[PDB]
């Protein structure tokens, strides 16, 4: 990465380079600064009303709650809360601080310890078949912690119920709160419980002297989406100003990238935050503070080529920028010689008004050579002869030559 | 190819049967791809070589075992002969050709009128050094005398554009 | 057809974009990009050799005379007119304006906003040819003037002038007809020739299909390459920045490797098909060179090679990515 | 020889059979089947 010649020598894997012209990587431009744009929010999320509550719900009638317009700084849980199980599925935990979440729902219930392994996408069992089921395409997090000091009573607490004896298996995020008599045999239950007709709900005991597997556990399931919509709920990152017409690193509501930001003529419907192109890349974005549409454009663009007379004679080179009209910015350096061919700006070569044959082709009728300096010139097709052609004159030979040539195949 | 190592013995020395199968499969896939690419490019090159060899055989049959009238096929000029020589992975043809060297200018006419009849050469051209009129062959100045054996008559002298008056002999 | 389009690919910009993680992950493979570009470079070098082998036979640039005292034959529609910047012919112009479509495209123009900008923003480059259209036209005019002033002599050495009707007499003798026929029906023959050239012009002022097929094929290929970037190849997303924004270094490497593999495969397929097409183009160009040497610089006795009928002469004209032969029989 | 045999391929029936899961999983790739069949169609047209 010192110069284009060294780029070439690394490409070929040799310290020596032969006469010619070589294509190199394209013209790159590196970002100057970094931009972050999140919404304007002040409230902190209700971590206490959710985690530090008074009574939870039963797994058969599990509770669900919406969360919106809040900052998700969870380090406030470190002083009080100690979780036994925490698992996130469509996201890594080391990234929860630099994202913004879209449709956040919290589900809450109480179960027995040995059943906690059942809160997962597959995991058949009593809890997953009849009480609570997660989908296969789940994006969110599961959290569980012991509560034997609150939900346990000496004589036994009998206020937490689970459903046994269902006819079929539940579907994802479905709830059944029916109290009907379950027919095990073929006898036709007339709404009474005899010997094959069961009440389908049962209770836990939850005594404090029980074993760690028969002790109560409080469970919270958080569900959300990422990077397709306004994303009201956000993290604790701090925002900056807007910078335009400059290559920057940016984070827009959790979406990171690199490029130049400009003003656009597009118009988004209120249920839109991002815009994609044919290749599914993000080309437009709405600002979460000003609400104006910005276009995104890359920074690296344009081909580059190197012209070399050979390292056994010189280390002088010329450089050709194919998409520049220097008559003068996007270049690795300026100098004393600039030509502006039809194949790009040529830097490092002297232009002469003569015409020779082609030694090193460049293009559009331009060739190069080494004289000592490097010269560029329009090449020659040959000489002029101007046959005579009178209407009564003829030329005829008076001698001959025997020629011998070679052809190799 | 997206694996912890490129050496099978490292993998097999620090991983078991179940955890090593993943990485070994990755390596297998990649190296198979490499061989496929090699064979494809060889197939594409062999066709170029075949075309060149067919051309060389055509040239040995048409330029060595005979005399060609095709232009710029067996050399540059008017073909006389050719000789083959062998070379590593190929053949070298030595083409012997005829070239005209020294040109001189002359005056022309398409026909000649003698007795109300037009005469044409039948093997050459009519030329004039300025006073006399000779008949000649085209690729070598060897002038002769205009007679009735090196000419043939066709019609009369009223239709040919450029005709000339002179004397035909016997 | 005589030539196709030249192309180059920056593989890092196509596969990884402006991401440094993908860039460092891609160094493992490494050799395959160098391989691909070696192949494409070979193709590009072969194209100019094709053009040169067809159009640059002679190295004497013969100028045409100002009298035009031919035997009633009129080559005004095939010879140049010193009036346009394209110092070329009537029919050559008609051909030029019948095929749609190297040059410069600045960043300021593509900034914000076609298909070419999208190609360029992903490392797909089209290179200009060495010989310009003006040079090819010069070559063609030189060949025409040589044929018209000297005959089949400028192809075997130095050009020896000869009157035109005297040359048509030779070319008649060559098909098995005497000279008296020519010198006795000169006027009729010239009028026929002129009306036939006029019919050619009138039918072209209202078929160039293969020269168009070539262009269309190339464009299709490059745009297919661009569109194949919306594929996931068995991964959670097709965008690297989503992956990198919701996943860490260890969990993202899996998906990034999947994407790398797939996009590499795509480029390989592109290069393979280009290799297979360049061979067709090469065969056609070799045929065209054989035809320029045997049908223009001489007179052929092969049947249905230089036209339909008994061959008398031929004239060349240039066309975008190819050549048009006018056979007189 | 003057001609060879013409062929067509339905890629879904080869890769996925009569399975709907594989069918829906295969929509991601998508372009490559169209590409293959374009090529084979060219061959078949060239034979005649
Ligand atoms: C007597 C054994 C017969 C086994 C028959 C063969 C295969 C059946 C396989 C597994 C059945 C046992 C599952 C036990 C777990 C119950 C579900 C749960 O509570 O998590
Ligand atoms: C998951 C589940 O049990 N769905 C049931 C379905 O089996 C039944 O057919 C329907 C009767 O209307 O009610 C509902
Ligand atoms: C009269 C009656 O059945 N009311 C009940 C309610 O007490 C119970 O809590 C609920 C389950 O959520 O089902 C209903
Ligand atoms: C949660 O409530 C407990 C019970 O009093 C208390 O000890 C703890 O400080 C609370 N956590 C918070 C949010 O401070
Ligand atoms: C660059 O811009 C100049 C305007 O001064 C223009 O005349 C020239 O044609 C452009 N260069 C090319 C070859 O595109
Ligand atoms: C034929 O005549 C032309 C016209 O003057 C002359 O220039 C040319 O040299 C002549 N050719 C030869 C072979 O002398
Ligand atoms: C050639 O044709 C054009 C137009 O028909 C015109 O120059 C003229 O008729 C011809 N040239 C002559 C007669 O000199």
UniProtKB/Swiss-Prot annotation, chain A:
Impact after mutating residue 193 to Q: In strain: Kappa/B.1.617.1
Phenotypic consequence of residue 199 to S: In strain: Lambda/C.37, Omicron/BQ.1.1, Omicron/XBB.1.5, Omicron/EG.5.1
Receptor-binding motif as annotated region, ranges: 146-217
Region ranges (Immunodominant HLA epitope recognized by the CD8+): 157-165
Effect the entry attributes to changing residue 40 to Q: Reduced viral infectivity
Effect of residue 126 to T: In strain: Gamma/P.1
Impact reported for residue 202 to R: In strain: Omicron/BA.1, Omicron/BA.2, Omicron/BA.2.12.1
Glycosylated sites: 32, 34, 40, 52, 312, 325, 353, 391, 399
Region (Receptor-binding domain (RBD)): 28-250
Phenotype upon changing residue 55 to K: In strain: Mu/B.1.621
Outcome recorded upon mutating residue 193 to A: In strain: Omicron/BA.1, Omicron/BA.2, Omicron/BA.2.12.1, Omicron/BA.2.75, Omicron/BA.4, Omicron/BA.5, Omicron/BQ.1.1, Omicron/XBB.1.5, Omicron/EG.5.1
Outcome when changing residue 207 to R: In strain: Omicron/BA.1, Omicron/BA.2, Omicron/BA.2.12.1, Omicron/BA.2.75, Omicron/BA.4, Omicron/BA.5, Omicron/BQ.1.1, Omicron/XBB.1.5, Omicron/EG.5.1
Result, substituting residue 55 to T: In strain: Omicron/BQ.1.1, Omicron/XBB.1.5, Omicron/EG.5.1
Listed result of changing residue 383 to V: In strain: Beta/B.1.351, Iota/B.1.526
Annotated effect of mutating residue 193 to D: Increased replication in human TMEM106B overexpressing cells
Consequence the record notes for mutating residue 279 to D: In strain: Alpha/B.1.1.7
Outcome following mutation: residue 48 to D: In strain: Omicron/BA.1, Omicron/BA.2, Omicron/BA.2.12.1, Omicron/BA.4, Omicron/BA.5, Omicron/BQ.1.1
Annotated spans, Disordered: 28-44, 164-199, 228-250
Reported impact of residue 214 to H: In strain: Omicron/BA.1, Omicron/BA.2, Omicron/BA.2.12.1, Omicron/BA.2.75, Omicron/BA.4, Omicron/BA.5, Omicron/BQ.1.1, Omicron/XBB.1.5, Omicron/EG.5.1
Record annotation: effect of changing residue 114 to N: In strain: Omicron/BA.2, Omicron/BA.2.12.1, Omicron/BA.2.75, Omicron/BA.4, Omicron/BA.5, Omicron/BQ.1.1, Omicron/XBB.1.5, Omicron/EG.5.1; complete loss of interaction with host integrins
Effect of substituting residue 77 to I: In strain: Omicron/XBB.1.5, Omicron/EG.5.1
Phenotypic consequence of residue 202 to Y: Reduced host ACE2-binding affinity in vitro
Function description: Attaches the virion to the cell membrane by interacting with host receptor, initiating the infection. The major receptor is host ACE2. When S2/S2' has been cleaved, binding to the receptor triggers direct fusion at the cell membrane. When S2/S2' has not been cleaved, binding to the receptor results in internalization of the virus by endocytosis using host TFRC and GRM2 and leading to fusion of the virion membrane with the host endosomal membrane. Alternatively, may use NRP1/NRP2 and integrin as entry receptors.
Protein name: Spike protein S1
Organism: Severe acute respiratory syndrome coronavirus 2 (2019-nCoV)
Residues of the full protein shown: 292 to 727 of 1273
UniProtKB/Swiss-Prot annotation, chain B:
Glycan attachment residues as annotated in the record: 105, 129, 165
Impact reported for residue 12 to F: In strain: Omicron/BA.1
Effect recorded for residue 102 to H: In strain: Kappa/B.1.617.1
SS bonds (residue pairs): 63-74, 113-157
Effect of residue 13 to A: In strain: Alpha/B.1.1.7
Domain of life: Viruses
Its biological purpose: Subunit of the fusion protein that is processed upon entry into the host cell. Mediates fusion of the virion and cellular membranes by functioning as a class I viral fusion protein. Contains a viral fusion peptide that is unmasked after S2 cleavage. This cleavage can occur at the cell membrane by host TMPRSS2 or during endocytosis by host CSTL. In either case, this triggers an extensive and irreversible conformational change that leads to fusion of the viral envelope with the cellular cytoplasmic membrane, releasing viral genomic RNA into the host cell cytoplasm.
Name listed for the protein in its UniProt record: Spike protein S2'
Gene: S
């Amino acid at each position: 990465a010192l110069d284009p010649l060294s780029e070439t020598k690394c490409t070929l894997k040799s310290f020596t380079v032969e006469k010619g012209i070589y294509q190199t990587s394209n013209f790159r431009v590196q970002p100057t600064e970094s931009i972050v744009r999140f919404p304007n929010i002040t409230n902190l999320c209700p971590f206490g009303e959710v985690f530090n509550a008074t009574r939870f719900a039963s797994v058969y009638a599990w509770n669900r709650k919406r969360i919106s317009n809040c900052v998700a700084d969870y380090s406030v849980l470190y002083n009080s809360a100690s979780f036994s199980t925490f698992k996130c599925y469509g996201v890594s935990p080391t990234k929860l601080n630099d994202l913004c979440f879209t449709n956040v729902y919290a589900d809450s219930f109480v179960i027995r310890g040995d059943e906690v392994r059942q809160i997962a996408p597959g995991q058949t069992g009593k809890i997953a078949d009849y009480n609570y089921k997660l989908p296969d395409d789940f994006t969110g997090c599961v959290i569980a912690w012991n509560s034997n000091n609150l939900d346990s009573k000496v004589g036994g607490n009998y206020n937490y119920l689970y459903r046994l004896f269902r006819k079929s298996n539940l579907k994802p995020f479905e709830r059944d709160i029916s109290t009907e008599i379950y027919q095990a045999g073929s006898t036709p239950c007339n709404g009474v419980e005899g010997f094959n007709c069961y009440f389908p709900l049962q209770s836990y005991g939850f005594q404090p002297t029980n074993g760690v597997g028969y002790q109560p556990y409080r469970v919270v399931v958080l569900s959300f989406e990422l990077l397709h919509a306004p994303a009201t709920v956000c993290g604790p990152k701090k925002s900056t100003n807007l910078v335009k017409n400059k290559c920057v690193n940016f984070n827009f509501n959790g979406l990171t990238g690199t490029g130049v930001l400009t003003e656009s003529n597009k118009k988004f419907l209120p249920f839109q935050q991002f815009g994609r192109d044919i290749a599914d890349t993000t080309d437009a974005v709405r600002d979460p503070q000003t609400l104006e549409i910005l276009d995104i454009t890359p920074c690296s663009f344009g081909g580059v080529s190197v012209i070399t007379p050979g390292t056994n004679t010189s280390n002088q080179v010329a450089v050709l920028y194919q998409d520049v009209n220097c008559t003068t910015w996007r270049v690795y350096s300026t100098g004393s010689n600039v030509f502006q061919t039809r194949a790009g700006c040529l830097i490092g070569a002297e232009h002469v008004n003569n015409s020779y044959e082609c030694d090193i082709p460049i293009g559009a009728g331009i060739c190069a050579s080494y004289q000592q300096s490097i010269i560029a010139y329009t090449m020659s097709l040959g000489a002029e002869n101007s046959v005579a052609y009178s209407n009564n004159s003829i030329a005829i030979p008076t001698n001959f030559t025997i020629s011998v040539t070679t052809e190799i195949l | 190819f997206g694996a912890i190592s490129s050496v099978l013995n490292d993998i097999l020395s620090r991983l078991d049967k179940v955890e090593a199968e993943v990485q070994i499969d990755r390596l297998i896939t990649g190296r198979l791809q490499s061989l496929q690419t090699y064979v494809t490019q060889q197939l594409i090159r062999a066709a170029e070589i075949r075309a060149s060899a067919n051309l060389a055989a055509t040239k040995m049959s048409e330029c060595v075992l005979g005399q060609s009238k095709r232009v710029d096929f067996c050399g540059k000029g008017y073909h006389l002969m050719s000789f083959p020589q062998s070379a590593p992975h190929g053949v070298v043809f030595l083409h012997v050709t005829y070239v005209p060297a020294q040109e001189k200018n002359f005056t022309t006419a398409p026909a000649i009128c003698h007795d109300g009849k037009a005469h044409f050469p039948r093997e050459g051209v009519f030329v004039s050094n300025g006073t006399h009129w000779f008949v000649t062959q085209r690729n070598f100045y060897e002038p002769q005398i205009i007679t009735t054996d090196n000419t043939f008559v066709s019609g009369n002298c009223d239709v040919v554009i450029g005709i000339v008056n002179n004397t035909v002999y016997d | 057809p005589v030539s196709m389009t030249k192309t180059s690919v920056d593989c890092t910009m196509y596969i990884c974009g402006d991401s440094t993680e993908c860039s460092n992950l891609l160094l493992q493979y490494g050799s395959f990009c160098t391989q691909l570009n070696r192949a494409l470079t070979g193709i590009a070098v072969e194209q100019d050799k094709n053009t040169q082998e067809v159009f640059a036979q002679v190295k004497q640039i013969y100028k045409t005379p100002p009298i035009k005292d031919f035997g009633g034959f009129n080559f005004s529609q095939i010879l140049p007119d010193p009036s346009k910047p394209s110092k070329r012919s009537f029919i050559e112009d008609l051909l030029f304006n019948k095929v749609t479509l190297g040059f410069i495209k600045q960043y300021g123009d593509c900034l914000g906003d076609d298909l070419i900008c999208a190609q360029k923003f992903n490392g797909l480059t089209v290179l200009p040819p060495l010989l310009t259209d003006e040079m090819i036209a010069q070559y063609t005019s030189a060949l025409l003037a040589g044929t018209i002033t000297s005959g089949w002599t400028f192809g075997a050495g130095a050009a020896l002038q000869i009157p035109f009707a005297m040359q048509m007499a030779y070319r008649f003798n060559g098909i098995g007809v005497t000279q008296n026929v020519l010198y006795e029906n000169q006027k009729l023959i010239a009028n026929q020739f002129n009306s036939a050239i006029g019919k050619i012009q009138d039918s072209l002022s209202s078929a160039l299909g293969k020269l168009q097929d070539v262009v269309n094929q190339n464009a299709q290929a490059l745009n297919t390459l661009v569109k194949q970037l919306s594929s996931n190849f068995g991964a959670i997303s097709s965008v690297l920045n989503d992956i990198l924004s919701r996943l860490d270094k260890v969990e993202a490497e899996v998906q990034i490797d999947r994407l790398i593999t797939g996009r590499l495969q795509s480029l390989q397929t592109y290069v393979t098909q280009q290799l297979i097409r360049a061979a067709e183009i090469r065969a056609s160009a070799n045929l065209a060179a054989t035809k320029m040497s045997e049908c223009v610089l001489g007179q052929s006795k092969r049947v249905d090679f230089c036209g339909k009928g008994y061959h008398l002469m031929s004239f060349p004209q240039s066309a975008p990515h190819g050549v048009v032969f006018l056979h007189v029989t």
